[PDB]
């Protein structure tokens, strides 16, 4: 009813448009509290890489199940998603990426399960069916370290009794604010190449108790701080494709109101047209 | 083509047996689809209990615009005498039309859309004279032949809307003088859901009073949640979580509204309309996936049949419902869940 | 106007159109985008405006014959005492179905208990 | 539970054979209800026809 | 013992239930069958007659 | 009309229908949100409806001097066999492009080869 | 049509402020005066000034109110003070 509603319907989309607008903005500012957050947790990273690098490759050469390297029958993967819509494709394309793979090593006869960050996730592994061990989500914007010790833990246990022998992490790269890449790495075994010294391991640390609790202790830190900075990482690009879909919804709303402005243009001058012809043939 | 004269028809024929005598009056239309029309009721036993009353689209406007007329005075003697009569016209916006050509040929001023200004009175004279009369009118007309009977006329009329637009001047009309509406609608029609009623739209004004005491129980309940059903599921639409009300609210809709689609020309009696509503208000449908709804009707119809039909005959001529029917009705509904399959 | 109803009723009916109008705008964002875009302060309002909404209804006793069910009558007093009630947190936790041809406030917790 | 095992053995297979039978003979009733009602109504159908 | 009883049964009464709906479709074949029969007899006897 | 057309054809020309309905009430949809916001069954209908609408294109003999490409003719049993194939997703591997202005089922996977 | 070309200026009321509860209901942005800052006096003159432009910020930001939770705090003074002259 172009006199009625048409009217109104335009007002809907006009509203809507002015929302989206916001929350392009919105996002764009939280892409960028998330990002300080994320080079923030580099270094602590990269400092206990290097301590595990002197252990590791110093010149008396240690031996863990974290380390060591094993043959594959079981793989493991854990896998991080959104717990908000929009955000356009970024959970699908990882999760077809990860069936990739998971059919990958099923065509090997490998047995795989996942462990899972996020609601979205949850529900298209188990609409797939795929064996999930082990849940957290509800973490929003400021996510903490506490939440994930709980998925890391069973499967860490699983890792060293050998029901898993092979875990990666599966997860968004923020590349930049312009591009994000869904990818796959290895956690366990520690795949990091080898590293070499001097100064390092000659002036040896002196060790309290003992050098093996504190590989022990130090590892599980580790692989712990590697999915912390993941899930950081994922967040961001999570604004920043909530971002990008923004700005696509508010061209699209400005795209769909000029339409729907030359269809009610022509019934605004159409109905004049016909109303005059029925006034002046009634003035018979 | 959403079903408009299908309706119609099959409110004709399902009268075959009930004594309600049928007219159908066909306004405008080509003469090859009364000639399909009539070999479907011949088809049934329905024509046998019905007048045709023709003026197709050949026929002069004034021939067209006395068609209802003539097939009221038809039923008229039935409902004079103390008999029951069914009226159809179909397509009284072809009556206006007719109307209009009249009018404008004579040279009387056009008011809106073109159409004379007295075409209220032409439809709502028509549609006044459908009613129910009292016993006293009817000795009085009779003459002391007949006494203790009262006579009725149901009228049926059918509108067509261009775009779904109501408010066109004919349309208006009818819906103004009416005792309510059934809306027709493309959009449930091409979804596969027919008859393509929509439950939002359409209301009788006389409701309830006009039921058997079961379907007034089992009904009343059916239409107004189902309306809510779509309001529910337009908000829903993209919200990930549902509370188990409206978990419950989102799938009880979406059951209902498959229960109640049927093939044309398969009328059902009260008996096997009501133990299927039962099945669904009684929440018996519930655990049965969606597309086996349709074939879980089919089976507990062919299944009562068989086994229970001295209460089919039972709720088919009393209509009755207590305490003792729908225990009997819980019995067939646990014994065919069990027993059966889809 | 308070000149005529007094404050207590003028207060009561300007509190449901300044509520009922908040989530007539909010009611458009959630049929696009969800719920979830919203401040939970709009959501409370989107809770207690569709409350509010339900509550307003009122089974007639000329309409048993639609209905089948037995009609109600409200005193003015009790009216006001109800849509506070909603206005307010009373009430918070009673689904939406509960408010739907209930009669008073004080048999929609009946009908919740029910549901 | 060497005897349980036992006791449960019996009593699903003795449930499972009933109820496969019982399946089995009213697809039978089944059929011969619907062969029934065509039989008959193929008569029904062509004495209105020759009254026609 | 339990668990393998227990899978027997399942395999038992889904097989006897999908016999059941083959028995019904051949019933179904015999009723269309009959019916379109009757019809096309029915028909050759009225045109018999008329045309007598 | 099933008594006269058949039951086959019948609910074939019922499935097609509801399925391109449905695919024009996700159109507003997708034309604010784009695609991804679909759920994934919501997905698999449009996958199939725009296959759907390009597989009812047809090469006809007197268009040539406008396609170039040569006319087809299509049986009845080759027509209802196509949609309902496709309908039933056994064709959910090809392309949309594999579908556009080819005779039968048949000539749209020889086209699917060559992409 | 007519009588918004012969006139001077405009006060639109409109109703959803007037729901809403702004009852005085006036919609500004729409309204307009083509006399002006002439029509007034020294003191209004020159207060009045701020109004018109708080309430053109606070236009644009009240479709951020939603989220108002995450903004430059600049941002959220201009709203928050848009908000108390409304
Ligand atoms: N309940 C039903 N189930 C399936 N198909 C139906 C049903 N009712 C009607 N149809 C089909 O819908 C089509 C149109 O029906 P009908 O001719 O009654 O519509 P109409 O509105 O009268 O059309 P017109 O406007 O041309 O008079 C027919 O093909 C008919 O077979
Ligand atoms: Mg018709």
Redesign the pocket.
């Known amino acids: 009813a172009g006199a009625k509603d048409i009217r109104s319907k335009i007002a809907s989309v006009q509203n809507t448009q002015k929302i989206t607008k916001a929350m392009e903005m919105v996002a764009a500012s939280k892409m960028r509290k998330s990002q300080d957050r994320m080079a923030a947790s580099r270094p602590y990273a990269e400092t206990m890489r290097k301590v595990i690098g002197h252990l590791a490759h110093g010149n008396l050469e240690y031996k863990h199940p974290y380390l060591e390297d094993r043959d594959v029958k079981r793989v493991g993967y854990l896998v991080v998603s959104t717990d908000r819509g929009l955000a356009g494709g970024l959970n699908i394309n990882l999760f077809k990426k990860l069936l990739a793979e998971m059919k990958t090593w099923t065509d090997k006869g490998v047995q795989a399960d996942l462990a899972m960050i996020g609601s979205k996730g949850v529900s298209f592994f188990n609409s797939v069916g795929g064996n999930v061990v082990a849940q957290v989500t509800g973490m929003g914007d400021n996510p903490s370290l506490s939440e994930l010790i709980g998925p890391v833990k069973v499967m860490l246990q699983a890792y060293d009794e050998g029901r898993l022998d092979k875990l990666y992490i599966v997860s968004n790269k923020f590349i930049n604010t312009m591009s994000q890449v869904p990818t796959i790495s290895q956690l366990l075994p520690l795949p990091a190449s080898d590293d070499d010294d001097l100064k390092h391991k000659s002036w040896d640390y002196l060790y309290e108790p003992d050098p093996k609790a504190l590989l022990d202790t130090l590892l599980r830190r580790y692989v712990e701080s590697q999915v912390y900075q993941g899930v950081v990482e994922n967040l961001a690009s999570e604004q920043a494709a909530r971002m990008v879909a923004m700005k696509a919804a508010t061209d699209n709303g400005g795209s769909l109101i000029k339409e729907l402005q030359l269809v009610y243009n022509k019934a605004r001058q159409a109905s004049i047209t016909q109303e005059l012809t029925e006034i002046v043939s009634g003035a018979a | 083509?959403?079903?408009?004269?299908?309706?119609?028809?099959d409110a004709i024929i399902n009268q075959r047996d009930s004594g309600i005598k049928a007219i159908y009056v066909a306004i405008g239309?080509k003469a090859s689809?009364i000639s399909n029309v009539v070999r479907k009721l011949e088809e049934h036993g329905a024509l046998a209990n019905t007048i045709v009353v023709v003026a197709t689209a050949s026929e002069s406007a004034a021939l067209q615009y006395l068609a209802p007329y003539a097939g009221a005075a038809m039923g008229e003697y039935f409902r004079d005498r103390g008999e029951d009569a069914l009226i159809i016209y179909?397509?009284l916006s072809k009556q206006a039309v007719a109307y209009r050509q009249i009018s404008l040929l004579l040279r009387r001023p056009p008011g809106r859309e073109a159409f004379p200004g007295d075409v209220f009175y032409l439809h709502s004279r028509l549609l006044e004279r459908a009613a129910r009369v009292n016993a006293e009118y009817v000795e009085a007309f009779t003459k002391g032949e007949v006494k203790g009977k009262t006579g009725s006329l149901t009228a049926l009329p059918?509108i067509?809307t261009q775009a779904g637009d109501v408010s066109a001047f004919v349309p208006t009309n009818v819906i103004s003088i009416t005792d309510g509406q059934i809306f027709?609608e493309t959009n449930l029609?091409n979804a596969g859901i027919?008859?393509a009623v929509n439950p939002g739209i359409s209301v009788s004004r006389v409701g309830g009073a006009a039921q058997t005491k079961i379907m007034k129980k089992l009904s009343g309940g059916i239409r107004t949640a189902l309306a809510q059903y779509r309001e529910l599921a337009a908000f829903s639409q993209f919200a990930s979580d549902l509370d188990d009300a409206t978990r419950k609210q989102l799938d009880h809709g979406q059951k209902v509204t498959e229960l109640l689609?049927?093939?044309?020309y398969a009328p059902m009696s009260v008996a096997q309309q009501s133990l299927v509503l039962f099945a669904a208000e009684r929440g018996y449908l519930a655990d049965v996936e969606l597309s086996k709804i349709g074939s879980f009707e089919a089976a507990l119809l062919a299944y009562v049949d068989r086994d229970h039909a001295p209460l089919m005959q039972e709720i088919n001529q009393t209509g009755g419902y207590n305490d003792e029917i729908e225990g009997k009705l819980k019995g067939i509904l646990d014994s065919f869940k069990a027993t059966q399959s889809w | 106007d308070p000149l005529v109803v007094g404050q207590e009723h003028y207060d009561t009916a300007r509190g449901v159109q300044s509520i009922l109008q908040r989530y007539q705008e909010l009611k458009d964002i959630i049929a696009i985008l969800g719920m979830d875009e919203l401040s939970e302060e709009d959501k409370l309002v989107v809770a207690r405006a569709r409350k509010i909404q339900r509550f307003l209804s009122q089974p007639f006793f000329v309409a048993e014959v639609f209905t089948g069910s037995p009609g109600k009558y409200v005193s003015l007093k009790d009216t006001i005492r109800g849509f506070k009630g909603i206005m307010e947190g009373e009430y918070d936790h009673l689904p939406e179905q509960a408010f739907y041809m209930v009669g008073s406030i004080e048999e929609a917790v009946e009908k919740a208990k029910k549901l | 539970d060497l005897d349980l095992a036992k006791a449960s053995a019996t009593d699903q297979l003795k449930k499972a054979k009933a109820e496969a039978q019982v399946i089995i003979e009213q697809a039978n009733k089944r059929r011969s209800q619907i062969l029934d009602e065509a039989k008959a109504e193929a008569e029904q159908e062509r004495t209105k026809i020759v009254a026609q």
């Open positions: 083509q959403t079903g408009k004269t299908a309706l119609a028809i239309q689809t179909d397509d059918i067509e027709l029609f027919r008859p689609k049927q093939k044309q």
